[PDB]
Amino acid sequence: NSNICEVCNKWGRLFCCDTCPRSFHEHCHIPSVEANKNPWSCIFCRIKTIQERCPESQSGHQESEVLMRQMLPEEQLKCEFLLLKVYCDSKSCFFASEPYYNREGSQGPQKPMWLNKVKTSLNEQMYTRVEGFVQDMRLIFHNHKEFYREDKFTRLGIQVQDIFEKNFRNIFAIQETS
Numbered sequence: 001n002s003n004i005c006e007v008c009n010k011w012g013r014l015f016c017c018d019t020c021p022r023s024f025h026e027h028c029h030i031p032s033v034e035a036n037k038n039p040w041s042c043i044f045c046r047i048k049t050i051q052e053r054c055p056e057s058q059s060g061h062q063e064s065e066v067l068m069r070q071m072l073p074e075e076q077l078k079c080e081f082l083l084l085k086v087y088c089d090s091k092s093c094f095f096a097s098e099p100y101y102n103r104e105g106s107q108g109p110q111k112p113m114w115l116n117k118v119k120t121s122l123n124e125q126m127y128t129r130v131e132g133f134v135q136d137m138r139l140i141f142h143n144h145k146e147f148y149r150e151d152k153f154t155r156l157g158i159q160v161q162d163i164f165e166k167n168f169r170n171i172f173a174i175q176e177t178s
């Protein structure tokens with residue numbers, strides 16, 4: 001097993017996956033590492049299994065159809081993993097906790113959003129469709145771009161959104177296009 005957290009790349013109190021070499025802090029893993037279960041398989045393993053049970057799940061899909069799917073167990077897991085993949089980028093630190101807005105010449109967003117909030121929303125099963133989760137994720141970056149305007153700090157929003165969008169296309173097997 002690895003000696004660092006797959007998500008935050010730090011050592012500490014780690015839980016090890018039984019079916020692959022990754023390890024996690026308790027609250028770095030999404031969902032949080034389960035109290036019992038021997039053996040335990042992490043979310044990367046659980047996602048690989050879904051693909052292996054249904055190879056045709058990797059054929060191209062239309063984003064519009066993916067967004068209308070109901071948050072049944074497998075969609076729920078895919079959204080948890082996609083959220084996890086955003087947290088794996090160190091730049092996610094800017095978007096994790098509740099932001100505040102006091103900058104000359106800007107007004108704060110009408111609907112603030114942040115990754116920990118989305119994490120809680122997923123945990124409490126507040127999303128009924130994939131669309132709900134994806135809208136909140138995209139809102140995070142859109143609020144950032146609008147607030148920071150021409151400051152070069154807007155680029156952090158672009159960078160982290162690209163990570164989200166690439167992983168969204170991979171996980172939900174969106175049809176490749178030019």
Ligand SMILES: [Zn+2]
Pocket residue numbers: 005006007008009010024025028
């Ligand atoms: Zn960690």
Ligand SMILES: [Zn+2]
Pocket residue numbers: 017018019020021022041042043044045
């Ligand atoms: Zn694993």
Ligand SMILES: [Zn+2]
Pocket residue numbers: 053054055
């Ligand atoms: Zn099948």
